[PDB]
Amino acid sequence: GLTATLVREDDKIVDLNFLIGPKLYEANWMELQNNGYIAKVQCAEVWCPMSPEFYREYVAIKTKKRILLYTMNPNKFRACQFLIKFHERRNDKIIVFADNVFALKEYAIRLNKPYIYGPTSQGERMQILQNFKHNPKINTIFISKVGDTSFDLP
DNA sequence: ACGACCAATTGAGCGGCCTCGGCACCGGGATTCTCGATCAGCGATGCGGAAGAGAGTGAGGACGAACGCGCCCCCACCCCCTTTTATAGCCCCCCTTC
């Protein structure tokens, strides 16, 4: 068995020890960065402050609807737009990731950038990746879970 | 001189049974509302079953081809033009007679 992320939220990961066997190896990612085999990634967490009228509803609504409201707010939106503009003018390739399609669409449309999600046909899907990779005028793509679940993204 | 004691008086306060049942506390009662599982959700995968896009070929189109006939040309070559004379009948135009 091979995998990049030998972790799952269920208590079934331990079954791999009898379904396949013990961990034959597990790379030290920091060592690989020190050796240059892996890119040095300066991870960060942007604490976007929620907007007051959003928090008012967010705190009021306790149902699953709050996932959308915490996902869509001016500050998070402005922060992404700012980081994108900055890195785009910095000539950096940027990949945007999201789960909820509603937020993904409303963000990508307002940012006039091409998104990618499940029902997007393989031809349309790959055509966007080729443009992003090669066309200098495009430098970011908005991908749903399709990008992280299983894919070969540039 | 008065202060306590004694007596007769008495009835409010007290010690108690009575009883009880409103309320609260206490504990123990089938419970209106808890939690702990099932099923539902969002967005993804894949499989399995469904449609449309390209094909064929009926066929008739346009028209390239292949032939003969056709008109027409450029081409050898051949004959006629012109001259002379003998010779004659034959012929027409003209003159001439009636």
XYZ file of C-alpha atoms (C1' of nucleotides) in Angstrom:
252
model
C 0.000 0.000 0.000
C 1.060 3.539 -0.854
C -0.423 6.839 0.261
C 0.534 10.456 0.857
C -1.976 10.930 3.736
C -2.274 7.823 5.937
C -4.960 9.474 8.070
C -8.750 9.337 8.149
C -11.415 10.546 10.557
C -12.693 7.027 11.251
C -11.047 4.566 13.628
C -10.461 2.185 10.709
C -6.955 3.387 9.795
C -5.547 0.787 12.200
C -7.109 -1.938 10.048
C -4.327 -1.300 7.522
C -1.969 -3.123 9.895
C -3.889 -6.363 9.304
C -5.474 -5.616 5.924
C -2.097 -4.789 4.343
C 0.589 -4.661 7.017
C 2.784 -2.368 9.103
C 4.199 0.954 7.941
C 7.163 -0.142 5.824
C 8.350 3.483 5.660
C 7.183 7.020 6.419
C 9.177 9.959 5.047
C 10.241 12.848 7.282
C 8.778 15.783 5.351
C 11.058 18.287 7.078
C 14.124 16.266 6.076
C 12.863 16.198 2.482
C 12.564 19.986 2.577
C 16.059 20.242 4.068
C 17.215 17.962 1.225
C 15.257 20.028 -1.314
C 13.181 17.043 -2.456
C 10.070 18.945 -1.309
C 9.267 22.627 -1.750
C 9.559 24.866 1.303
C 5.953 25.934 1.968
C 5.367 28.903 4.285
C 1.955 27.848 5.560
C -0.283 30.498 7.091
C -3.720 30.946 8.665
C -5.511 34.209 7.835
C -7.897 35.061 10.698
C -10.568 36.810 8.665
C -12.846 38.792 11.028
C -16.508 38.053 10.416
C -18.748 40.953 9.423
C -21.166 42.099 12.160
C -24.386 41.535 10.201
C -23.045 38.100 9.255
C -22.178 37.179 12.843
C -25.643 38.359 13.885
C -27.180 35.790 11.548
C -24.387 33.234 12.028
C -24.976 33.184 15.785
C -28.743 33.121 15.223
C -28.710 30.245 12.715
C -27.481 27.030 14.344
C -28.295 24.748 11.400
C -25.952 23.640 8.610
C -26.657 26.996 6.918
C -23.963 28.633 9.078
C -21.271 26.755 7.113
C -22.181 28.892 4.096
C -22.325 32.166 6.036
C -18.930 31.613 7.689
C -17.594 30.652 4.235
C -19.021 33.785 2.545
C -18.287 37.163 4.121
C -16.757 40.438 2.853
C -13.585 40.117 4.941
C -12.757 36.576 3.832
C -13.707 37.603 0.282
C -11.644 40.816 0.363
C -8.713 38.927 1.924
C -8.710 36.329 -0.865
C -9.143 38.964 -3.587
C -6.249 40.934 -2.062
C -3.942 37.910 -1.742
C -4.835 36.891 -5.304
C -4.239 40.351 -6.787
C -0.953 40.592 -4.870
C 0.337 37.170 -5.936
C -1.030 37.649 -9.472
C 0.837 40.943 -9.812
C 3.727 39.010 -8.226
C 3.388 36.551 -11.161
C 2.668 33.603 -8.853
C 0.530 30.651 -9.907
C -2.358 30.429 -7.443
C -4.802 27.605 -6.748
C -8.020 28.438 -4.903
C -9.756 25.641 -3.012
C -13.306 25.452 -1.695
C -15.948 22.906 -0.727
C -19.411 24.477 -1.087
C -20.227 25.091 -4.749
C -22.455 28.079 -3.925
C -19.571 30.035 -2.403
C -17.183 28.780 -5.103
C -19.423 30.114 -7.891
C -20.251 33.476 -6.289
C -16.570 34.035 -5.510
C -15.193 32.969 -8.906
C -17.858 34.935 -10.815
C -17.273 38.091 -8.752
C -13.536 37.564 -9.299
C -14.226 36.775 -13.006
C -11.999 33.702 -12.703
C -12.624 30.159 -13.986
C -13.816 27.682 -11.374
C -13.780 23.876 -11.573
C -16.213 21.434 -9.959
C -17.783 17.985 -10.370
C -20.276 18.418 -13.238
C -17.658 20.320 -15.275
C -16.892 17.950 -18.156
C -13.383 16.549 -18.557
C -12.852 18.541 -21.748
C -13.830 21.851 -20.161
C -11.950 20.862 -16.994
C -8.661 20.091 -18.769
C -8.949 23.017 -21.202
C -8.932 25.330 -18.170
C -5.825 23.628 -16.753
C -4.007 24.007 -20.074
C -4.885 27.706 -20.255
C -3.829 28.245 -16.629
C -0.536 26.403 -17.163
C 0.348 28.119 -20.451
C -1.625 31.363 -20.893
C 0.272 34.119 -19.002
C -2.931 36.187 -18.663
C -4.474 33.542 -16.368
C -2.792 32.643 -13.084
C -5.433 31.163 -10.767
C -8.091 28.443 -10.786
C -10.950 27.817 -8.345
C -11.173 24.065 -7.704
C -13.726 22.132 -5.655
C -13.030 18.878 -3.775
C -12.348 17.377 -7.235
C -8.874 18.922 -7.022
C -7.906 17.423 -3.658
C -9.827 14.122 -3.735
C -7.818 12.694 -6.651
C -6.218 14.620 -9.514
C -2.987 15.527 -11.307
C -3.087 19.326 -10.991
C -0.225 21.478 -12.321
C -41.279 51.142 105.235
C -41.608 48.209 102.484
C -40.671 44.243 100.709
C -41.786 39.367 100.288
C -44.760 36.131 101.394
C -49.952 34.008 101.411
C -54.132 33.586 100.204
C -58.004 33.812 96.764
C -58.580 34.813 92.415
C -58.194 34.030 87.203
C -57.486 33.795 82.585
C -53.461 34.348 79.019
C -50.157 32.010 77.966
C -48.399 27.662 77.635
C -47.809 22.244 76.776
C -50.045 19.234 74.855
C -53.169 16.178 72.048
C -55.464 16.489 68.243
C -55.159 16.172 62.995
C -53.749 17.241 58.931
C -52.840 18.923 54.776
C -50.226 23.162 52.307
C -46.335 23.304 51.409
C -41.570 21.980 51.067
C -38.446 19.180 51.716
C -37.146 14.224 51.133
C -37.202 9.976 48.646
C -39.078 7.194 46.107
C -42.650 6.650 42.361
C -43.888 5.811 35.660
C -42.333 9.016 33.581
C -41.963 14.301 28.771
C -38.171 14.883 27.652
C -32.673 13.707 27.634
C -29.376 11.174 24.949
C -27.206 7.476 21.879
C -27.873 5.122 16.808
C -29.759 5.532 12.255
C -30.442 7.703 8.412
C -29.801 12.129 5.661
C -26.815 15.577 3.640
C -23.053 17.957 0.332
C -20.233 17.163 -3.410
C -17.278 13.626 -5.197
C -16.257 9.051 -7.376
C -17.358 5.042 -10.412
C -20.341 1.730 -12.660
C -24.331 0.498 -15.201
C -27.929 1.450 -18.281
C -29.781 5.432 -21.851
C -29.557 9.084 -26.447
C -27.105 11.651 -30.993
C -23.306 12.017 -34.853
C -21.255 9.655 -38.523
C -21.878 6.208 -41.770
C -24.238 3.878 -46.322
C -26.779 4.139 -50.747
C -30.718 4.564 -52.982
C -30.624 7.255 -56.758
C -30.595 11.172 -59.966
C -27.547 15.986 -60.977
C -23.641 18.265 -63.932
C -20.579 17.421 -67.338
C -16.059 15.002 -69.067
C -15.546 12.214 -72.227
C -15.766 9.599 -76.990
C -17.373 9.123 -80.895
C -19.459 11.123 -86.412
C -20.665 14.383 -88.760
C -20.158 18.509 -90.137
C -18.071 23.212 -92.179
C -14.321 25.045 -93.161
C -9.262 25.849 -94.347
C -4.605 25.577 -96.611
C -2.781 22.864 -99.914
C -0.758 20.570 -104.918
C -1.368 20.760 -109.499
C -3.444 21.504 -113.431
C -5.587 23.797 -116.819
C -6.496 28.178 -119.107
C -5.311 32.548 -120.223
C -2.439 34.897 -124.644
C -0.120 34.990 -129.539
C 0.155 33.003 -135.003
C -1.708 30.410 -139.207
C -3.944 27.140 -142.291
C -8.835 24.825 -142.678
C -14.204 24.098 -142.560
C -18.904 23.804 -140.856
C -21.558 25.654 -137.499
C -23.724 29.457 -135.288
C -25.578 34.255 -133.872
C -26.191 39.120 -134.713
C -27.133 41.894 -137.822
C -28.711 43.407 -142.384
C -31.741 43.011 -145.972
C -35.629 41.775 -148.801
C -40.109 40.924 -149.175
